[PDB]
Short mmCIF file of C-alpha atoms and ligand atoms in Angstrom, two decimals:
data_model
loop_
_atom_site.label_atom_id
_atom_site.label_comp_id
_atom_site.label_asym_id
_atom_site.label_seq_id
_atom_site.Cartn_x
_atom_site.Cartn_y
_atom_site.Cartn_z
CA UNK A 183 0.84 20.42 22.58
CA UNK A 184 -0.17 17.70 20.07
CA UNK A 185 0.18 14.11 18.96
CA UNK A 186 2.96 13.93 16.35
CA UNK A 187 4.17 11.07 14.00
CA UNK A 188 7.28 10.83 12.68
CA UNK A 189 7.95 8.20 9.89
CA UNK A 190 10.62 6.77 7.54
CA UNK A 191 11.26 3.61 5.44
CA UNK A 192 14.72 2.50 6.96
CA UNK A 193 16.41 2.10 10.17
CA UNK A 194 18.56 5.15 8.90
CA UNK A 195 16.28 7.55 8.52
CA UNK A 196 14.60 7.16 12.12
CA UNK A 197 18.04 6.02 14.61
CA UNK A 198 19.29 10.07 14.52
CA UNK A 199 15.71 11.17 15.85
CA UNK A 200 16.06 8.18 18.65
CA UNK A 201 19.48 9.33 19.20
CA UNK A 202 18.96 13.16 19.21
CA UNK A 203 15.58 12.01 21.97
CA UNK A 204 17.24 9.50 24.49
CA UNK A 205 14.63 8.70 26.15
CA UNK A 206 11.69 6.87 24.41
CA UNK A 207 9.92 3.64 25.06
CA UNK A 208 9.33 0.55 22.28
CA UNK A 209 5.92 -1.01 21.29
CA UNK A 210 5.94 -4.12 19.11
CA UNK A 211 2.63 -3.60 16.68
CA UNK A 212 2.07 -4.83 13.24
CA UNK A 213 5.52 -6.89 12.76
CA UNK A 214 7.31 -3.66 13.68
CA UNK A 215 8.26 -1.36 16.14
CA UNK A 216 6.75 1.74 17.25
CA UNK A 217 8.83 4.27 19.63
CA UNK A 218 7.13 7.20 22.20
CA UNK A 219 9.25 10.08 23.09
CA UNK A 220 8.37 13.10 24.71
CA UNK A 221 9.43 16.97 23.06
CA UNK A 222 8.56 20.42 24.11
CA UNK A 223 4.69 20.07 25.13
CA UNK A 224 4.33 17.32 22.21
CA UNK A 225 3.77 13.32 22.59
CA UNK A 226 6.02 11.95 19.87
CA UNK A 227 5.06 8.40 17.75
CA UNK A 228 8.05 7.46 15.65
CA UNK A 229 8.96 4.38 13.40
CA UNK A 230 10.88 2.91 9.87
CA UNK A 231 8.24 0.94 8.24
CA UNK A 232 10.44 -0.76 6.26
CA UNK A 233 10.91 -0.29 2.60
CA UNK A 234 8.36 0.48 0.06
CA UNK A 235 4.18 1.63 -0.38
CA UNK A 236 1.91 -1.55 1.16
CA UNK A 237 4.48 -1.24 4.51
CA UNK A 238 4.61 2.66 4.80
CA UNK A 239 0.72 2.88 3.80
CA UNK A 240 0.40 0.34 7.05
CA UNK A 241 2.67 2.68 9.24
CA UNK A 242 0.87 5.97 8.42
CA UNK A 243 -2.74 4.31 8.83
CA UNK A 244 -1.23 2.31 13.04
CA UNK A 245 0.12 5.79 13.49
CA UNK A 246 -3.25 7.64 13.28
CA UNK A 247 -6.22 5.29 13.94
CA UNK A 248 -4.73 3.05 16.74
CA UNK A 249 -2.02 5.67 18.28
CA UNK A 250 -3.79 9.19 17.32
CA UNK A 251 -1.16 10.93 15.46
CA UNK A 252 -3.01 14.54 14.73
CA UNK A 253 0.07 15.47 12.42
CA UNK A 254 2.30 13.31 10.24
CA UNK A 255 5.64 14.36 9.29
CA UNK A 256 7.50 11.88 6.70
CA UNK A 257 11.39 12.08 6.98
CA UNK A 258 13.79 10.62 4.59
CA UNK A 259 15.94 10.21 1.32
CA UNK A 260 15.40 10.45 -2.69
CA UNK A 261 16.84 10.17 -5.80
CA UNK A 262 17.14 13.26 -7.68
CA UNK A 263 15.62 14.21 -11.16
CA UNK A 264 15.95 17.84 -10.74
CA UNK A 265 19.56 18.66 -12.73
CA UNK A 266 19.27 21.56 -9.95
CA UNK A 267 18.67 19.27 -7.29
CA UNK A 268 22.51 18.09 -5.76
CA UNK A 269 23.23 15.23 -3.42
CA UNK A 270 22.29 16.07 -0.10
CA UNK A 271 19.77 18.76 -0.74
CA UNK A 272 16.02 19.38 0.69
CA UNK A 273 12.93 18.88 -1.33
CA UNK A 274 9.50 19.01 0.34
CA UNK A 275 6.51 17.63 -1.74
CA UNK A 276 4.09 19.77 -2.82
CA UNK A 277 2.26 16.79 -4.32
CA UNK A 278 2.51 13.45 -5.21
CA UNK A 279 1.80 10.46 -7.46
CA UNK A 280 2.47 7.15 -7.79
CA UNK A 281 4.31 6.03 -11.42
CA UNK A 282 3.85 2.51 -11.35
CA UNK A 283 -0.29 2.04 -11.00
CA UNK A 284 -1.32 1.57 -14.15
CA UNK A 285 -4.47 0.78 -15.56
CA UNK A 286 -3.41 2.70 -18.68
CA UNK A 287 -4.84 -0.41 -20.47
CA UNK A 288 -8.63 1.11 -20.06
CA UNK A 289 -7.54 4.33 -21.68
CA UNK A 290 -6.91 6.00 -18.02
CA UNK A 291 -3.72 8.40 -17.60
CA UNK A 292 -0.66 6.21 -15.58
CA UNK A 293 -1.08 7.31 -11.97
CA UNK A 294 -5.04 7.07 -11.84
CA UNK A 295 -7.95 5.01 -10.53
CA UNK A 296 -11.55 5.17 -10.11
CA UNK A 297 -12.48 7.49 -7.14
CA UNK A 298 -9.28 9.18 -6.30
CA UNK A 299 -6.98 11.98 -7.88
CA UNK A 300 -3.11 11.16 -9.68
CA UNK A 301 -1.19 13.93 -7.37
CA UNK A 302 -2.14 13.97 -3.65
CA UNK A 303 -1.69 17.24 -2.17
CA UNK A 304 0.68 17.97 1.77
CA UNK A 305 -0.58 20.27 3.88
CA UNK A 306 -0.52 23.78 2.71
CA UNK A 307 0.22 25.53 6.63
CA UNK A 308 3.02 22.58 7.62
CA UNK A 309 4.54 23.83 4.02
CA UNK A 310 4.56 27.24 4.87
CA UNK A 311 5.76 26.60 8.71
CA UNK A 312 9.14 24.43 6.38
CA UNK A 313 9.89 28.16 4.46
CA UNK A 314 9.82 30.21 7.80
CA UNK A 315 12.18 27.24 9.45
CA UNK A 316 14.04 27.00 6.44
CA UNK A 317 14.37 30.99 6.43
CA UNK A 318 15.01 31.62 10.07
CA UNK A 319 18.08 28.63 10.59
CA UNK A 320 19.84 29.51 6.92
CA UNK A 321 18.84 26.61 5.43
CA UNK A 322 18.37 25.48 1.59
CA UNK A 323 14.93 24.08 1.12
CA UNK A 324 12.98 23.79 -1.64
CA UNK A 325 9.25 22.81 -2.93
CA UNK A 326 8.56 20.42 -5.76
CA UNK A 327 6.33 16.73 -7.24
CA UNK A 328 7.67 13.66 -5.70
CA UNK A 329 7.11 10.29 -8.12
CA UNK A 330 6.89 7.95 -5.56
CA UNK A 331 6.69 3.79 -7.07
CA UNK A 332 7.87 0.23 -5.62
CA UNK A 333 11.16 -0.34 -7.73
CA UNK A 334 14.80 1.51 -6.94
CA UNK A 335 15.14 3.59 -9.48
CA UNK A 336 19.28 3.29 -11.48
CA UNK A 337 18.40 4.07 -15.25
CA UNK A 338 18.28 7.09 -17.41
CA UNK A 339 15.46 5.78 -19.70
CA UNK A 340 13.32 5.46 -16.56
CA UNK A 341 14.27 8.68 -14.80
CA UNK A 342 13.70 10.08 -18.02
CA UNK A 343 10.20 8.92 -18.78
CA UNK A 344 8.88 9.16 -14.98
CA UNK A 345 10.01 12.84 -14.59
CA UNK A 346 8.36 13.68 -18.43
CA UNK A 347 5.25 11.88 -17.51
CA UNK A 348 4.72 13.60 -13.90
CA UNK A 349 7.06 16.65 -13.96
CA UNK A 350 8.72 15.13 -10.99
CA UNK A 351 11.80 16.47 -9.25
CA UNK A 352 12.64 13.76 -7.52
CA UNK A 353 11.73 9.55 -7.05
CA UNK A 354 11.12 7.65 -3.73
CA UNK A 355 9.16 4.36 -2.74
CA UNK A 356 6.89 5.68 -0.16
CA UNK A 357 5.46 9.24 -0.58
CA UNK A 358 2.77 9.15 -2.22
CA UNK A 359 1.31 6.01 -0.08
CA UNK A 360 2.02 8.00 3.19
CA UNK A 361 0.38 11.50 1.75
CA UNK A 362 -2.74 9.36 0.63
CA UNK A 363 -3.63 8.05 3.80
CA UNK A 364 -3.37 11.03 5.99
CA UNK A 365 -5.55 12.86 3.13
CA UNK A 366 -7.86 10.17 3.65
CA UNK A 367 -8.11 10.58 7.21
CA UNK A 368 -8.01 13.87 7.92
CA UNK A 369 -4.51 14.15 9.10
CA UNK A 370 -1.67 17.13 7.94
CA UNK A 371 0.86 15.30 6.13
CA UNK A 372 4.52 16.99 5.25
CA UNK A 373 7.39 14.93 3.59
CA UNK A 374 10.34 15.90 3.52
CA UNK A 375 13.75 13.97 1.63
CA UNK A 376 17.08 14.63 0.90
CA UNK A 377 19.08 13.49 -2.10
CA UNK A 378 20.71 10.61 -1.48
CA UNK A 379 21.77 9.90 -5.66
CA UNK A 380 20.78 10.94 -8.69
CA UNK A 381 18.33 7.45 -9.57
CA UNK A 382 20.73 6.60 -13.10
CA UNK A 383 23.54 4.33 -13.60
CA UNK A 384 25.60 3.66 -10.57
CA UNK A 385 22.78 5.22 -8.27
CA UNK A 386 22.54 2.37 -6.18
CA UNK A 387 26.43 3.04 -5.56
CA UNK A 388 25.95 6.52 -4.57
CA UNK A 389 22.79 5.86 -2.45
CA UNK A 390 25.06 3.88 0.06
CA UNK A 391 27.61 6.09 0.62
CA UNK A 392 25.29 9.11 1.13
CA UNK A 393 22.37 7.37 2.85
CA UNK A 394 23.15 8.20 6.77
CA UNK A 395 24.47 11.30 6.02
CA UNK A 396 21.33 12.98 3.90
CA UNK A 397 18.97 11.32 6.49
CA UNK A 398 20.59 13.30 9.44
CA UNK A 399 20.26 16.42 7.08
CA UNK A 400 16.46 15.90 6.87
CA UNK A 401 16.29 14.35 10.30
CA UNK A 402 17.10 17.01 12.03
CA UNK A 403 14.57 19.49 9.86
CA UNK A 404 11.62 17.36 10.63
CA UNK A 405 12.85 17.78 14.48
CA UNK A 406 13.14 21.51 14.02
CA UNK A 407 9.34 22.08 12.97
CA UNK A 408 8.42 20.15 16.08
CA UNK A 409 9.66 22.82 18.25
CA UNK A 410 7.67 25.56 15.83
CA UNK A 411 4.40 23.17 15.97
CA UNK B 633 -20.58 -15.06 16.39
CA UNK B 634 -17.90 -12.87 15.18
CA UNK B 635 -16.55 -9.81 13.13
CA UNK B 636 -15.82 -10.42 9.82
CA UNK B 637 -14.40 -7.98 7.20
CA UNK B 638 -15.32 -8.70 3.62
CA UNK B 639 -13.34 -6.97 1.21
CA UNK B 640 -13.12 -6.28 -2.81
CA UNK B 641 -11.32 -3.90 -4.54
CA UNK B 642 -14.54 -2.54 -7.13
CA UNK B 643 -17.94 -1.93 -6.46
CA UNK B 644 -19.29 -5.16 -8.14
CA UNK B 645 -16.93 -7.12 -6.36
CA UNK B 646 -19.25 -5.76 -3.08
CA UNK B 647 -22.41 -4.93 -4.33
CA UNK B 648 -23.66 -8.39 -4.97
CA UNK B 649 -23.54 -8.90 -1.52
CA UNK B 650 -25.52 -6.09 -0.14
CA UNK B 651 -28.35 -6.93 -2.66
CA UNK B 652 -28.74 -10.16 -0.95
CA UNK B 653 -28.28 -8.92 2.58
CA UNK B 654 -30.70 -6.44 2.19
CA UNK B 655 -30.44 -4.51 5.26
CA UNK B 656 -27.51 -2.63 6.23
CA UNK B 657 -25.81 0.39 7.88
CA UNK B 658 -22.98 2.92 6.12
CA UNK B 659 -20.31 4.92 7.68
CA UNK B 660 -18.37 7.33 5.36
CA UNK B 661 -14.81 6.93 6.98
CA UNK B 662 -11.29 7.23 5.21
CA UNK B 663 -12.58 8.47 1.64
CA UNK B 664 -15.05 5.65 1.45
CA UNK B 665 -18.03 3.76 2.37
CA UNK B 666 -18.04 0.91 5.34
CA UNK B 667 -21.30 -1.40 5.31
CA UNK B 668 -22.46 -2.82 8.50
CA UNK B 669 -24.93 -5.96 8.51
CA UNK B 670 -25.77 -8.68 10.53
CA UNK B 671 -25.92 -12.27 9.11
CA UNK B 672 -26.63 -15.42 11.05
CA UNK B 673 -24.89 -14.89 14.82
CA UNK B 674 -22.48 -12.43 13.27
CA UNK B 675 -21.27 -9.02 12.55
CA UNK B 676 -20.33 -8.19 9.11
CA UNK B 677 -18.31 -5.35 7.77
CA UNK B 678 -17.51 -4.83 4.05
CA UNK B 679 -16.30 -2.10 1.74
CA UNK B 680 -14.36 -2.05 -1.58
CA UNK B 681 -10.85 -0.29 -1.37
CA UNK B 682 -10.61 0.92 -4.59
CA UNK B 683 -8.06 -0.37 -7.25
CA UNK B 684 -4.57 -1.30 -6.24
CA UNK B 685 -2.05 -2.21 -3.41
CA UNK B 686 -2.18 1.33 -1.36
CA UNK B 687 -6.21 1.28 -1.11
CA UNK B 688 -6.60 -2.20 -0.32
CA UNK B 689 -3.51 -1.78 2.34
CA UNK B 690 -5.60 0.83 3.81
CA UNK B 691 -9.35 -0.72 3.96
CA UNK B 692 -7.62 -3.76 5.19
CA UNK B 693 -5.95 -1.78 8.17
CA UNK B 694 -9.41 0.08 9.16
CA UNK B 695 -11.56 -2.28 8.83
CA UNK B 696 -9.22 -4.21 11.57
CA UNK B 697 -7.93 -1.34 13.72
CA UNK B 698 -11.33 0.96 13.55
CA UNK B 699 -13.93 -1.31 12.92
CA UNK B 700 -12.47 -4.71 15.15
CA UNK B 701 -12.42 -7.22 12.44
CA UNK B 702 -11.26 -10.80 13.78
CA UNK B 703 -11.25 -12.45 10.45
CA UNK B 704 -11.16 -10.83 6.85
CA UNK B 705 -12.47 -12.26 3.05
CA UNK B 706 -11.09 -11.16 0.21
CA UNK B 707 -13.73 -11.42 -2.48
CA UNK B 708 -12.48 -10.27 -6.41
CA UNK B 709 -11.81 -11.35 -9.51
CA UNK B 710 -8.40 -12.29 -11.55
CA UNK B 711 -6.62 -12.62 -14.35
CA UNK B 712 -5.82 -16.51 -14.96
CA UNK B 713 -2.03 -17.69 -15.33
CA UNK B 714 -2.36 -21.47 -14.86
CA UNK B 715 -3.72 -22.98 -18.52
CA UNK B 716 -6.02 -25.18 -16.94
CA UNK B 717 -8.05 -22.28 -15.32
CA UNK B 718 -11.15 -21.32 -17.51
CA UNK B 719 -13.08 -17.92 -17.15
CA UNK B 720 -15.61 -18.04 -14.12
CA UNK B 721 -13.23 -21.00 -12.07
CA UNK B 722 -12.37 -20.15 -8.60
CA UNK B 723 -9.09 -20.32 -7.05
CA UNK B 724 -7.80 -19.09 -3.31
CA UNK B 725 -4.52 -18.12 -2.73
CA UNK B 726 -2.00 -20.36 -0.71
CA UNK B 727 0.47 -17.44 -0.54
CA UNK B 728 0.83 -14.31 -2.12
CA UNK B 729 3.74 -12.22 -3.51
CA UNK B 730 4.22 -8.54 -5.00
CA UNK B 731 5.77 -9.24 -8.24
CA UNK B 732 6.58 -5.28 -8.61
CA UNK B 733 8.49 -4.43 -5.35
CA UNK B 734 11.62 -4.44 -6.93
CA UNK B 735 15.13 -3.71 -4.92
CA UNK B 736 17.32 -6.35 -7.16
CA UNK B 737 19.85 -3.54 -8.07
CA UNK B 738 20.88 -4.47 -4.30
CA UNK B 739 21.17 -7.54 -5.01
CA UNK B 740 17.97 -8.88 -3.33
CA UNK B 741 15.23 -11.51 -5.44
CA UNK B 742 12.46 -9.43 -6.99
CA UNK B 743 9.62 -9.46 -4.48
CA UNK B 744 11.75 -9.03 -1.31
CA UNK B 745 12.42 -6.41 0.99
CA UNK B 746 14.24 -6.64 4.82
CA UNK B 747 12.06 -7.39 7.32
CA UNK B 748 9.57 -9.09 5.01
CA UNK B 749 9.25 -12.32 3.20
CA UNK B 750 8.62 -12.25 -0.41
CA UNK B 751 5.48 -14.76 -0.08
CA UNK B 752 2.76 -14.10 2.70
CA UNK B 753 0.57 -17.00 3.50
CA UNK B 754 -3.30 -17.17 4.02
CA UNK B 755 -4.96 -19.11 7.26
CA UNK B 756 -5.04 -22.54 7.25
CA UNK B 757 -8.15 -23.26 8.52
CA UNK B 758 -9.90 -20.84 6.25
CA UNK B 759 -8.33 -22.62 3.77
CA UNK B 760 -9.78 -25.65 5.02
CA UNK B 761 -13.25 -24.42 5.42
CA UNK B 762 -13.49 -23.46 1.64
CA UNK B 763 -12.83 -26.78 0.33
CA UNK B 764 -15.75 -27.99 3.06
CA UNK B 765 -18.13 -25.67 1.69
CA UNK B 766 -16.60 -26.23 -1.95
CA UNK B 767 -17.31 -30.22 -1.94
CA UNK B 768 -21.07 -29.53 0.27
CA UNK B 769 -21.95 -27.41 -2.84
CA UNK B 770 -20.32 -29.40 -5.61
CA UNK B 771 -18.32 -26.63 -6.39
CA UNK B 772 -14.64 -26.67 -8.16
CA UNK B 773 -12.13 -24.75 -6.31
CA UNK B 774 -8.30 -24.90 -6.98
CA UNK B 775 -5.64 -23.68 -4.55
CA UNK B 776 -2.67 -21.74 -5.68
CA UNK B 777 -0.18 -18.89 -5.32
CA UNK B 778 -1.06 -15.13 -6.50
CA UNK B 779 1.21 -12.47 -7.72
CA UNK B 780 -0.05 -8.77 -6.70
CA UNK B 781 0.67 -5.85 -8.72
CA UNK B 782 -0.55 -2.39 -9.62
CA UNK B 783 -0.24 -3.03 -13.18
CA UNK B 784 -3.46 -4.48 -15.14
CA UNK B 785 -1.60 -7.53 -16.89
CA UNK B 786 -2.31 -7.94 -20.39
CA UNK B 787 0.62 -8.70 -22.50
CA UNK B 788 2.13 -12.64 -22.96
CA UNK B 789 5.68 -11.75 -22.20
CA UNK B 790 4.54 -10.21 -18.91
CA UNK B 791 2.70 -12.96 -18.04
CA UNK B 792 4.90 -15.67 -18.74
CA UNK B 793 7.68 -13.95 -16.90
CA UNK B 794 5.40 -13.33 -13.73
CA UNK B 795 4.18 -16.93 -13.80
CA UNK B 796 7.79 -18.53 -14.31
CA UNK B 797 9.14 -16.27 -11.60
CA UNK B 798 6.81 -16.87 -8.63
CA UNK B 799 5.17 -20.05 -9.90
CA UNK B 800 2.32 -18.03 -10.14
CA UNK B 801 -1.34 -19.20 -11.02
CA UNK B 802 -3.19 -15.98 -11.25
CA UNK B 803 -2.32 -12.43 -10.94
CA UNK B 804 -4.47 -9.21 -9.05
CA UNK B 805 -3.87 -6.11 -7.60
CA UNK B 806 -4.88 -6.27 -4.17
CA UNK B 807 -4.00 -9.69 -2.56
CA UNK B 808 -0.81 -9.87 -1.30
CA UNK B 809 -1.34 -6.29 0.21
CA UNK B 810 -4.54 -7.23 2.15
CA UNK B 811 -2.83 -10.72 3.21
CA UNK B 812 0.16 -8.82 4.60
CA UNK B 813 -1.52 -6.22 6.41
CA UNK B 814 -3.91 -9.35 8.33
CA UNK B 815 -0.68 -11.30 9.32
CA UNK B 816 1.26 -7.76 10.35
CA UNK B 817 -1.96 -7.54 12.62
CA UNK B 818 -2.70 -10.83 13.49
CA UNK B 819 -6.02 -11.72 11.55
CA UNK B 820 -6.86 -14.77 9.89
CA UNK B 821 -7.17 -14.20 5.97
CA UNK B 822 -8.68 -15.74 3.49
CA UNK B 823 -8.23 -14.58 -0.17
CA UNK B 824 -10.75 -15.93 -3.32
CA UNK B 825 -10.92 -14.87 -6.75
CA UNK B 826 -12.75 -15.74 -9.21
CA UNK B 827 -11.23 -15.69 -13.44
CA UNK B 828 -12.59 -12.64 -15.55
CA UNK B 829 -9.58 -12.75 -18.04
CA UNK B 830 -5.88 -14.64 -19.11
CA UNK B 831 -4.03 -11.43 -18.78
CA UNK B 832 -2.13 -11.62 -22.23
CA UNK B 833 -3.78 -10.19 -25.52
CA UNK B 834 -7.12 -8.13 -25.06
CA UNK B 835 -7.64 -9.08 -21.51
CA UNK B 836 -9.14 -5.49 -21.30
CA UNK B 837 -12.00 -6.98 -23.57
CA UNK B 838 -12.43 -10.01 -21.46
CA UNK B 839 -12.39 -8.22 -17.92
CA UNK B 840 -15.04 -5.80 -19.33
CA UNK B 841 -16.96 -8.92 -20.76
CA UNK B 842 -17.16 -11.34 -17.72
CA UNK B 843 -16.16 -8.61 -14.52
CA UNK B 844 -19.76 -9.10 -13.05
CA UNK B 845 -20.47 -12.20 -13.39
CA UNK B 846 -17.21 -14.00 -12.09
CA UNK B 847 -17.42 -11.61 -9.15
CA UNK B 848 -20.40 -12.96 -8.67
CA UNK B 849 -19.64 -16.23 -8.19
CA UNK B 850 -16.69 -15.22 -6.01
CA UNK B 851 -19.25 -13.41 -3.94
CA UNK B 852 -21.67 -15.79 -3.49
CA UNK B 853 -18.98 -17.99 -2.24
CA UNK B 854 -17.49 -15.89 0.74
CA UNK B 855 -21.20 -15.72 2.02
CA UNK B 856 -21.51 -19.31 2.59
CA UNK B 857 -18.43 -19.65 4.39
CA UNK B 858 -20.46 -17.33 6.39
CA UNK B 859 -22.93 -19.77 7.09
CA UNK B 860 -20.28 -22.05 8.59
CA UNK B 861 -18.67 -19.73 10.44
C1 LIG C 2099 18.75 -2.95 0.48
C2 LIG C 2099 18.61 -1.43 0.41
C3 LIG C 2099 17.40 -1.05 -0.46
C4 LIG C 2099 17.18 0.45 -0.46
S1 LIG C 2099 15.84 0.87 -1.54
C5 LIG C 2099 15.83 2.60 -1.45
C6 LIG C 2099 15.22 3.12 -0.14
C7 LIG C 2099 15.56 4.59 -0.02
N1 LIG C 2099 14.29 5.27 -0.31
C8 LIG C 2099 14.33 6.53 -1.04
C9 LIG C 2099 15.13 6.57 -2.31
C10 LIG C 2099 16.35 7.24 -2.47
N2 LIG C 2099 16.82 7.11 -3.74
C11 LIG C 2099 15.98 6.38 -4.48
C12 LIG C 2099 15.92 5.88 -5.87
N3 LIG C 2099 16.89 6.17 -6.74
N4 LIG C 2099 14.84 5.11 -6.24
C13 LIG C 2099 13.85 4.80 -5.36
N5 LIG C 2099 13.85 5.22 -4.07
C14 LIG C 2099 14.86 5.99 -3.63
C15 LIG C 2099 13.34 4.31 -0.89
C16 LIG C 2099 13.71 3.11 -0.08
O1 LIG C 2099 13.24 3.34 1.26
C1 LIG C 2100 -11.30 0.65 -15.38
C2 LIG C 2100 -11.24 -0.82 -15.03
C3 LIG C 2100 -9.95 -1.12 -14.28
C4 LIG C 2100 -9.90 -2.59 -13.90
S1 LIG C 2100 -8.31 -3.03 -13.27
C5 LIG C 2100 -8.55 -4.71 -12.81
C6 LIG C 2100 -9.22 -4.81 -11.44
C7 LIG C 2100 -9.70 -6.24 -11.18
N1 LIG C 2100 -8.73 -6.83 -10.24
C8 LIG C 2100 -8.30 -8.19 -10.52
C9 LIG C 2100 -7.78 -8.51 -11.91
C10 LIG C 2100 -8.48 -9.26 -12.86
N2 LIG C 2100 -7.77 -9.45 -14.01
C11 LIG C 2100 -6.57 -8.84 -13.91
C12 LIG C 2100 -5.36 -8.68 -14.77
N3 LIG C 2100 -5.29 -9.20 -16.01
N4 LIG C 2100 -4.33 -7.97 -14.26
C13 LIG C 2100 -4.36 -7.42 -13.02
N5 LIG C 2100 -5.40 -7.54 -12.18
C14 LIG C 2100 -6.49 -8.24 -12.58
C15 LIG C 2100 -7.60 -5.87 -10.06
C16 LIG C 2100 -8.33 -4.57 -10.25
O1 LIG C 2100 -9.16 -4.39 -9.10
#
């Protein structure tokens, strides 16, 4: 077997995993809590990070340099820009960029820096192991850009503008953070979300009533590919 | 002696350094370059991230976790809120806040999300070990709070509402990310910047203008709190 991580922002999208597991131990590490669970032949790392990109770039990077996570599987919610995309559905980032760094003021497209790319790209073979998984248990899934950025998103204008600018499909606070660090080192990264609202007026209404459920729907996929891995 | 991390965000943030060092080592780890050097009885490792809160998050973390850093120095530039602060002065952060993590549609203040505080603070003693070395060299130094972003500020609006907000004297994109990720792992940090704009109309000019020299001033200043050590 292998070293796996398993990582989302809230307590939400993690507790079903701990549940579903039983058995698991607690670390306290980097004002947080890591949990170890054993799963068919694979050692298990699991944690929430807590909201946003500095604390889920922090979780990803503990994860893989000081508990040797070889694969890092990012479980979790959205909000939906897809008019396709429903509440509850499964999107799995093909790539990923982050809307909100901006140096635009030195002529630069929004998304870009010096020295690295505006999408990040997941792992091409954990995508492909999601379609057979999605294919063999009847399940919905399907593959699209992720805008990932620090503020909730609950506005047309802005959905609007951050899906024309990036072609996105869907917005979250963490993505793109988690998918540039295991890119960086040398770690297979796969997120994963389900649609929690659709990020306009009144989204931060809908997000709380469909919060635990979506994140039991994508939950239980990430848990799925770990008996396939 | 010790391990100490010194961190920048841009190459001429860093590079002034390794000129006057002279003789050092490079390992290409996490989609970057980490310089090794000795100086006086200790160990020195520095690097610059790259722009922004996710690349600063991570060099922070690996320089720590990887490389065993027991104290880090954060070594930039900044754009200059406070009206008393001229182009070239130096200020180090008090405590530092991320003006754009934004959950208020839940009714939280803008800068806070659970689990964290919205301000992080620096080390004390660092603190007090720059104003040594500031009054030995008959040097002007000013304390203060930072707001971090991953917007380039240059608009008066912006900056006013920043400033009035978080009581902010300067704003930067890399602070309050590197200062969080040292407390998270139980470092002593010490963040200095030194003024290579005012962030409102044509900073963009201004940062292109004085960049190198003001972070060479900043520079030079980490160093000798080397010495002292
Ligand atoms: C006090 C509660 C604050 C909750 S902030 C939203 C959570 C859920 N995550 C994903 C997420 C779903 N919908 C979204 C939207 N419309 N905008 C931005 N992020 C999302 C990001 C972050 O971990
Ligand atoms: C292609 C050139 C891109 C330069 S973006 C600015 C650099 C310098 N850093 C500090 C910084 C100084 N002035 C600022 C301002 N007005 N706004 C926001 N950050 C700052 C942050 C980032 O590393």
């Amino acid at each position: 077997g292998m070293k796996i991580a398993i990582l989302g922002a809230m307590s939400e999208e993690i507790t079903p995993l701990l549940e579903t597991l039983k058995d698991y131990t607690k670390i306290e590490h980097a004002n947080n809590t890591y949990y170890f669970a054993k799963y068919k032949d694979h050692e298990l790392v699991l944690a929430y990070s807590k909201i946003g990109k500095v604390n889920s770039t922090l979780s990803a990077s503990v994860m893989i340099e000081k508990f040797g996570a070889q694969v890092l599987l990012f479980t979790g919610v959205a909000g939906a820009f897809n008019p396709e995309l429903e509440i509850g559905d499964l999107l799995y980032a093909t790539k990923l960029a982050q809307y909100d760094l901006d140096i635009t003021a030195f002529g630069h497209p929004l998304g870009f820096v010096p020295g690295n790319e505006i999408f990040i790209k997941t792992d091409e073979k954990l995508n492909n192991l999601a379609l057979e998984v999605a294919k063999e248990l009847n399940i919905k899934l399907r593959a699209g850009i992720i805008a990932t950025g620090d503020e909730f998103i609950c506005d047309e204008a802005k959905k609007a503008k951050i899906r024309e600018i990036f072609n996105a499909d869907a917005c979250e606070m963490e993505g793109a953070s988690v998918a540039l660090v295991c890119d960086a080192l040398k770690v297979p990264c796969f997120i994963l979300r389900a649609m929690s609202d659709k990020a306009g007026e009144k989204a931060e209404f809908d997000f709380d009533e469909f919060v635990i459920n979506s994140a039991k729907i994508s939950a239980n996929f990430v848990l799925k590919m770990c008996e396939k891995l």
